[PDB]
Amino acid sequence: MELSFGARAELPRIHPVASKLLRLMQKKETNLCLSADVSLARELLQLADALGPSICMLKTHVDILNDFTLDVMKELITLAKCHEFLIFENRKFADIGNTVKKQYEGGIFKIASWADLVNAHVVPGSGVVKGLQEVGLPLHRGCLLIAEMSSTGSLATGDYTRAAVRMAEEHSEFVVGFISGSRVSMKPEFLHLTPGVQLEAGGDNLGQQYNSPQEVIGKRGSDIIIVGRGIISAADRLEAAEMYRKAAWEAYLSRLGV
Amino acid sequence: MELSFGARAELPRIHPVASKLLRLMQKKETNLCLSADVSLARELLQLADALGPSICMLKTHVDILNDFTLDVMKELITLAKCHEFLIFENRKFADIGNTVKKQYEGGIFKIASWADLVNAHVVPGSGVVKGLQEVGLPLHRGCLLIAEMSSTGSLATGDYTRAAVRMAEEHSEFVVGFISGSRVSMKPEFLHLTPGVQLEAGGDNLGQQYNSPQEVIGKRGSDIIIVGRGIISAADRLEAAEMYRKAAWEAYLSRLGV
Ligand SMILES: O=C(O)c1cc(=O)[nH]c(=O)n1[C@@H]1O[C@H](COP(=O)(O)O)[C@@H](O)[C@H]1O
Ligand SMILES: O=C(O)c1cc(=O)[nH]c(=O)n1[C@@H]1O[C@H](COP(=O)(O)O)[C@@H](O)[C@H]1O
Ligand code: PRO
Ligand code: PRO
């Protein structure tokens, strides 16, 4: 009784941000999130415009954007609205609740003003979520909890992962899902986003480990692949994005069955 | 055979940043780190100038500084040099190694250019440290690993804490110690910095829990207290800093004994 993305978008307990995401995933036949860790606004915008039709989501890295301004983010929003994708900021919110709220709302970046989605580590306990929610729930935002990590020696295993799932399911007005390597919640209202994805086997020199779209979506039951270097380092980024999109989409269809 | 801060500064395996810190702690009779989560550069600078003599370290929050510029940090460095304290940025580095290095070096904040110390969560595995080190070791910097957290529901316990200690002791060319609630390493070359500290019992509304300087330094064996609201919210911040300094310093002396 596994439901399509379009049907999950209508579930009673679905979060509005998750519903918007699931609907556009179904409409566009894409479950690909591009991770755009680029230092130049022009490259970010040119990637978002050219690859926008191929992605359901753009993971931004504003901490590395040398020429960040809030106007760059206004232009990115225009592309996200045009092409229909969500903006997910990479910043790892991972402080006590009191401090995280100011990190999310304030400073020069004003992340909550333009990010549809943010992610948090659960290591501080549920106060990290409660603090983020005091800013994000009024701003109609969603959050992902990092329940598992792709890198060698990850401590996000076992009881840590279970605590992330419990924290999500108790803050469902704000938490829309997980960064994980596999399905970790049995509740279909939650999204599963999986980084550490390439078409070819391997890793990097600093602990990254890759699995394929077919493995992560098809066998491990995740919903969305997050891909950085497998696209960003390719010569033709559009073609690369299409290969990842078609891989992740067909893996989803085949797991759904008739 | 517990050694004074000044003797620890001379240990064979001491990191140069730790040695500088330990020497100034001994010289100034201060084991207080002020956490300055303020939104205005003028307030940050006025606090750093007035409280500089009373602290061994200033924990900055540049993600919330509304009027951040690199020149503000140049002025902060001038105060840190004058009054003799280290600058410790709060940003929770907690990504895979490849991504964390750009977060530390780049963007608008260029954290590695002005921060003596940074902190990392160990949840990604040791690649987080290896990535930070590829920027910080050439820049002569130090790192603290978050081995325990002060907040309710913290998952930084048990085997997680042990993994942080192992990661520190295998990256001693760069890791100078821990954010922890107590002594977690038996090796005296490592610093222990403890947040969640107030003179009075209690907590906040978002999971923070407080213990006193006497408890954390004297009974739990930590080296340095990190204090935010207990100073920042007081009317006379200088007096408050002196009360925290005298509390933490005497607790250290009494544990050292004859
Ligand atoms: O924050 C994440 O999405 C993340 C979590 C995790 O466990 N692993 C992981 O690789 N990521 C991110 O996903 C991206 C992966 O990049 P590539 O290895 O270049 O595809 C980077 O932005 C990482 O920060
Ligand atoms: O990053 C930290 O220093 C930190 C770790 C931890 O376990 N607990 C903790 O409170 N902190 C930080 O220490 C400061 C504590 O602030 P106050 O509760 O206002 O004293 C904040 O900047 C927190 O981000
Ligand atoms: O392992 C490697 O080095 C290359 C890059 C990731 C996939 N294959
Ligand atoms: O618990 C409280 O609310 C106050 C503030 C921290 C110490 N006492």
Would you list the domain boundaries of chain A?
Answer: 5-256
Nearest to A231 by CA among A68, A84, A47, A45: A47
Residue A93 three-state SS: strand
Query: CA–CA separation, B33 vs B44, rounded Å?
Result: 14
Q: How many CB atoms lie within 10 A of CB A145?
A: 29
Which residue's alpha carbon is at the smallest distance from atom 22 of ligand 1?
A35
Q: Residues B51, B55, B58, CA angle at the centre, nearest 5°? A: 85
- Nearest residue on chain B to A123, judged by CA atoms? B155
Taking CB atoms and an 8 Å cutoff, what residues of chain A touch B120?
A: none
Helix or strand (DSSP H, E) at A204: none
Would the CB atoms of A149 and B65 count as touching at under 8 Å? Answer: no
Distance in Å, CA B199 to ligand 2 centroid? 15
Q: Which residues in A188-227 are b (16+ Cβ under 10 Å) and which e?
A: bbbbbbbbbbbeeeeebebbbbbbbbbbbbbebbbbbbbb
A–B CB contacts, 8 A cutoff, strictly below: 186
Of all atoms in ligand 3, which is nearest to the CA of residue A202? 1
| Contacts with A29 (C-beta within 8 Å, 6 or more apart), sequence order | A245, A249
- Catalytic residue check, B92: yes
The DSSP letter of residue A197 is B
Please give the method by which this entry was determined: X-ray
Partner-chain residue, chosen from B107, B151, B156, that has the shortest CB–CB distance to A63: B107
Q: Which residues in A65-87 are b (16+ Cβ under 10 Å) and which e?
A: beebeeebbeebeebbeebbbbb
The DSSP letter of residue A125 is -
Query: CA–CA separation, B90 vs A114, rounded Å?
Result: 23
- Cβ(B86)–Cβ(B21) below 8 Å: yes
Long-range contacts from B229-233, C-beta under 8 angstroms, 24+ separation: B229/B198, B229/B204, B230/B197, B230/B198, B230/B199, B231/B34, B231/B51, B232/B34, B232/B35, B232/B36, B232/B37, B232/B38, B232/B47
SS (H, E, C) chain B: CCCCHHHHCCCCCCCHHHHHHHHHHHHHCCCEEEEECCCCHHHHHHHHHHHHHHCCEEEECHHHCCCCCHHHHHHHHHHHHHHCCEEEEEEEECCCHHHHHHHHHCCCCCHHHHCCEEEEECCCCCHHHHHHHHHHCCCCCEEEEECCCCCCCCCCCCHHHHHHHHHHHCCCCCEEEEECCCCCCCCCCCEEEECCECCCCEECCCCCEEECHHHHHHHCCCCEEEECHHHHCCCCHHHHHHHHHHHHHHHHHHHHCC
Which residue's alpha carbon is at the smallest distance from atom 8 of ligand 3?
A202
- Cβ(B65)–Cβ(B72) below 8 Å: yes
Q: Mutual orientation of helices A127-136 and A97-105 as an angle, nearest 10°?
A: 30
- Cβ(B154)–Cβ(A124) below 8 Å: yes
User: Nearest C-alpha of chain A: how many angstroms from B7?
Assistant: 33
Q: How many CB atoms lie within 10 A of CB B2?
A: 10
The residue of A35, A39, A43, A108 whose CB has the most chain B CBs within 10 angstroms, and thus the best one to mutate to test that interface, is A108
Identify the CATH assignment for B5-256 out of 3.20.20.70, 3.40.50.970, 3.40.630.10, 3.40.190.10: 3.20.20.70
Type of residue numbered A173: E
What are the tokens at B215?
Answer: 């408890």
DSSP of A131-157: HHHHHHTTTT-EEEEE----STT----
Residues of A assigned a catalytic role: 92, 95
Residue A54 three-state SS: helix
Query: CA–CA separation, B66 vs B218, rounded Å?
Result: 37
Residue A25 three-state SS: helix
Type of residue numbered B4: S
Would the CB atoms of A96 and B64 count as touching at under 8 Å? Answer: no
User: Nearest C-alpha of chain B: how many angstroms from A254?
Assistant: 31
Query: CA–CA separation, B186 vs B170, rounded Å?
Result: 14
- Cβ(A87)–Cβ(A80) below 8 Å: yes
- Catalytic residue check, B102: no
Helix or strand (DSSP H, E) at A90: strand A86-93
Taking CB atoms and an 8 Å cutoff, what residues of chain B touch A94?
A: 92, 94, 121
For ligand 4, whether the C-beta of B210 sits within 6 Å is yes
Would the CB atoms of B155 and A123 count as touching at under 8 Å? Answer: yes
Query: CA–CA separation, A7 vs B48, rounded Å?
Result: 56
Partner-chain residue, chosen from B64, B163, B206, that has the shortest CB–CB distance to A155: B163
